[PDB]
Symmetry: D2
Subunit: 315 residues, 4 copies
Amino acid sequence: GTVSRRKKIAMIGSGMIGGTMGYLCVLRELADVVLFDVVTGMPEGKALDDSQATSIADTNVSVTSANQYEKIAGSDVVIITAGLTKVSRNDLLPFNAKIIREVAQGVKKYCPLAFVIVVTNPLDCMVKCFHEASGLPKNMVCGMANVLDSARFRRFIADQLEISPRDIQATVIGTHGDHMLPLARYVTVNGFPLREFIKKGKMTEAKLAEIVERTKKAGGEIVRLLGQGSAYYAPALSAITMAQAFLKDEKRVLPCSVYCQGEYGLHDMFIGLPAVIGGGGIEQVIELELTHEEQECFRKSVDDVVELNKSLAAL
Amino acid sequence: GTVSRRKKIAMIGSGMIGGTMGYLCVLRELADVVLFDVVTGMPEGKALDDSQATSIADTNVSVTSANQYEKIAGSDVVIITAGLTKVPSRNDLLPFNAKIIREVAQGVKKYCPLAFVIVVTNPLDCMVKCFHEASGLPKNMVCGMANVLDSARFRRFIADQLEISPRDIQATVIGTHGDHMLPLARYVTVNGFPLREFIKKGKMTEAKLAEIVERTKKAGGEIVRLLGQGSAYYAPALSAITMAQAFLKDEKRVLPCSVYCQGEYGLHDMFIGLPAVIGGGGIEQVIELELTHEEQECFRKSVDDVVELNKSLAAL
Amino acid sequence: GTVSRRKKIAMIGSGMIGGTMGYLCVLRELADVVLFDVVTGMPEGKALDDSQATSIADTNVSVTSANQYEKIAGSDVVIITAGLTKVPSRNDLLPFNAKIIREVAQGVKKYCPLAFVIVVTNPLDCMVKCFHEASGLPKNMVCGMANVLDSARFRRFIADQLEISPRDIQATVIGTHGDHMLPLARYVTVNGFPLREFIKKGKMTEAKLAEIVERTKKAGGEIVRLLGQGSAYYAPALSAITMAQAFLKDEKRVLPCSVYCQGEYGLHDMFIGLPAVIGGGGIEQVIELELTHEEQECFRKSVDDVVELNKSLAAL
Amino acid sequence: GTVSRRKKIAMIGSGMIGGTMGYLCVLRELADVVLFDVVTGMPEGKALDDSQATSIADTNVSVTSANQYEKIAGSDVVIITAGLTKVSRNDLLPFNAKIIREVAQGVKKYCPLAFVIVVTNPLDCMVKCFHEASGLPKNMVCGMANVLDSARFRRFIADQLEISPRDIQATVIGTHGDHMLPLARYVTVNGFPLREFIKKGKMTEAKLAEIVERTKKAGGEIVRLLGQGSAYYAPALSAITMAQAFLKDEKRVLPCSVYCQGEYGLHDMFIGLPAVIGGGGIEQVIELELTHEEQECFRKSVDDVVELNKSLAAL
């Protein structure tokens, strides 16, 4: 009887990020939500909590919990946070590759036409692992990391310039850790190069460097401060912004881990790069004219990913 | 911001509910946020996470942490979730939480006495009374969040059964916490149409309604049971923030909450969950429903519970 | 957009209401928009203006104009405002608008037969019937916008008197156009609480309620009188788009509108304004209220009006 | 009794733009609205229409109409669209200077602490006229034009690159007409220079020039097409976005007509420039490092304004 069905997003992993992405769907009435996890009780508790929030938000989406993959059938988007968060993130490889392969089998069987956003660390490597195991088209698989990294880069710059982060364009590309690459040269204030602001003394080169470093250390700082767990509010919104850009065919520039077949001279691997997300999934991969120095920094990020993928293959 | 400053909301208690209310402020660009807690470290971590979310939401509010009451100065609204959640029965938390609530009251009284205060700390109705007495704030500027959450549950369950958005289900719970809370079955409507008309047309049975009333009472406990640790926070955070927004934007929304009684329902000098209108004047109206003799009997049980807890509160 | 395409809404008629519904789609990023009109030039101008607004709203939907029905192919919803607004009594527009509505029906039947259709063209109830008969579309996929707007007025007036947000005022108008429209005084509630309780507590008098009922009936005419040219469009556009969104997002909202009757209220094979639930299945429920004998008498007057207009419609 | 009062915006001019800005306030629950105009009936009809929309939007703001300035007392923001729209916009000068001076007297008397956004043409000249007559601080007076011009510039670029306009930073500065200056060199896609996209052939220099020209002619095209009146949907949102940035102290980069005391070597005049709008009104005026060629184009815009102000003084 239903002619116009709601979009459906399956959260594979119902931890803090998963439950929070479910909350965002309720607040924005973005889609029905399935909180999936191989955990007893907890996912149902969060589904009841999120479901009950629809009343106060005056929205109507269905939030349910599941532990069997058949329940993710028909999902338009799948967001994966399942996997270990601690035992180096590189060290998570063996344990999470196994989990990601199980998720890939579930998606391949029940919702192979979905757009998939991986969050599981080590991210770039796990995205490749999911892509290989699931068999999905390269434009329908990506990883969330750089949107979150860029959010931090932007917030720090916005604080210094006293301008809303909406008007700060700052992008981080590459992989996780200290090799991530906050592109200082491409930071703009509504398209106006940051270098002009530095020249006017609105920000010093030293402050910029401090911000670049802070962007790299941001996730670890939150981990240290929380004492248990890791960030979830910004990560959840980062992933849902990518999901909405796909669902509503918005065509948003959102840096994320995408499959390369020549871009930046890279082949057969996923790495964080500026991309356009729309109803066709990853519709564009933007290849920046990196300077020689930037390429050298980027190569280190690339090498980190290549090394992990080498180890992944050895499994 | 020399002329127009942003509203400011201090979250006294930076646990799951506090951090999530901060998140809502970021998403809606509702107000600058202060995540306050006696515990140091964790609030600063959540403040960093919530502030970083402003970039993705394309909003601009400030989110900071604090462990000093001086930092809540200038707050337009204060939402208190501080307090023990278990004894080292919510009624038993009285001793421990009354002390914490009194410390919070001292902080608010001194640093932001003109704030609208929403208490969440259990045992709720008793703690609202405790805060009001210790803070000396105007009776219309102090209330407690509970019934909006209880009603959200009542509404969601009814919405699911009738296949209608909860926006269009008006269902209200009044009273205190526990099995004595009172889901008002007679006042449930579908866009103003009495639920009884739907039951008569077979869209729901009286048995199902009774089941829904009972599920409403047990809902919080079910989530506690299922999460395994802690309690609900997504709907509670949105319930409190919806009350805060109604005040900040002078919306004049009907939101049942723990309010000071000066004759309504024959009650005096106490707070209890009742339908109320929240606007820029704080609690602008306390709605007095024409309860049947049977509903009055059930309500009296909540009254008795609160009155007894308050007697102990005084005895401190 | 190879996998997930945006919803699409065709505005058949690009006058003030049509251009404004397009604006709402841009603001909410609800859907791509086609501003259709037999008149060329003006729709393209409004499409440029509405599309340029996407930049400032930071949204991304396509807004284009058209004068060929082929361009409405793929529409999920079609909202029709086309038709004369005055004879070169709305009842008298029948001849002229029936012809236009039939042409629109032919266009929809051929190019987007699976669309959910919201008719706005006067005389409304008769034109909905005309469209349904000419288009052959399923009865649950055709409706008319009028009562949501009439109810918005009823609610705003009540909200002003009680000093409560209209979000919390449930007030409904049913029936047809004109003085016969029926604002249901007995079913007005404040968050499900009967208005009678508020009147009894002195928050409003029966005289004021009667005044509000009359103002609700005269509201459209007052705006026509005051604007000097044309009629209301901001609230009408939002009323129609709210109905469209309920369908697109399968919200299941209670929105009174002109719906096909198959026994409800004892009516058959005709459309008339009634409380209904709009979801992804189109008109999912037609709510049958337990009207008193007096309300039935008033309602019968609307029924008689529609039945008489439909007799003439047939006689064409 | 009310401790937390709603913001209040007075629309001086209740034509299509005024009524539409009132609608936006209702939809966003941004502020109470006063639809002011020295017209009988019409403003009240629009106030009833906009007021009735609050019910469907489930919001609560008060929308009233007025014809006496005392009714704008206490306004936080004042948006002025009053004045003739036709008889060259330069030719409107004599008629609109008189109207703007009357509005300035009303604001100076009843809400001198308001943030004022002028829309009345010829814009840059009328903003100066209002500032001089009202006596308000230079940071509290500005004119809306460039946000609308930039919206067009951005939409056209977004269409060509298949990217949401959210991610297109394109700015127009200067005055109205063909002398407005769409800054082609500062157009970015999330901070990435447009020149890189042109190099990749995603857009040709010819298409860019066509877009620059189209941006200049956009308002006139709508006028031609509508047959009567001029654009109002994008203009209304442009002005309300500036008003909200002030009310919520957002610190948004919004190009608008602002007072210069040295910026770009300009003195004692208002002209469209990139600015940051926050709770302090115009908090920053961004001085771009314009190239010699850009300065030459800008000088023509400046000369147009200077000529009008010369004529304004001669009144």
